[PDB]
Amino acid sequence: PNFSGNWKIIRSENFEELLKVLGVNVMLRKIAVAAASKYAVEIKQEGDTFYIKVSTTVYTTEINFKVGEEFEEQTVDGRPCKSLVKWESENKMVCEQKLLKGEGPKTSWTKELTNDGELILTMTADDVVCTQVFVRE
């Protein structure tokens, strides 16, 4: 597959519920949900190496990794973690995360390229799964 692209969000479900599990208070959850309404994901993929830039209106972050090699990023609620991405199939990868310090919910994410040109991101905290769908810009 080629995940490369400038991806624009078209749907976001269960994001507030995810943030609630992660301990974010109500007003900030609503504000974060609003920022997700228009956010972008830019992917450059070369073989098993990924460069990912996630951007909202006022914030941008980069996530760089090679599949199967541990790296450091942050959880959704911003806690530093160690991460490891593996393929689950031709067009889907899964990332397991472990907190660098302390305890907290078990978090992870997945990225899938569908056959109709959508990118599906999921983000999980314990029992709660957020699903977001993007198309290429």
Footprint of ligand RET on this chain (CB under 6 A)?
Answer: 32, 35-36, 39, 41, 52, 54, 56, 63, 76, 109, 111, 121
Of 17, 63, 62, whose CA–CA distance to 36 is shortest? 17
Residues in the chain: 137
At closest approach, how far in Å is the CB of 63 from ligand RET? 6
- Which residue number is nearest to ligand RET in terms of Cβ? 36
Question: What's the min distance (Å) between Cβ of 98 and ligand RET?
Answer: 15
CA 27 to chain centre: 22
Q: Residue 119 Cβ, how far from ligand RET at the closest point, in Å?
A: 9
**Residue 8 beta carbon to ligand RET: minimum distance, rounded to whole angstroms:** 13
Closer residue to ligand RET, CB minimum distance, 52 or 113: 52
- State the Cα–Cα distance between residues 133 and 115, nearest whole angstrom: 13
Q: What beta strand segments (E) does the chain contain? A: 5-13, 40-46, 49-55, 60-66, 71-74, 80-89, 92-99, 107-113, 118-125, 128-136
Q: Nearer to ligand RET by C-beta: 81 or 109?
A: 109
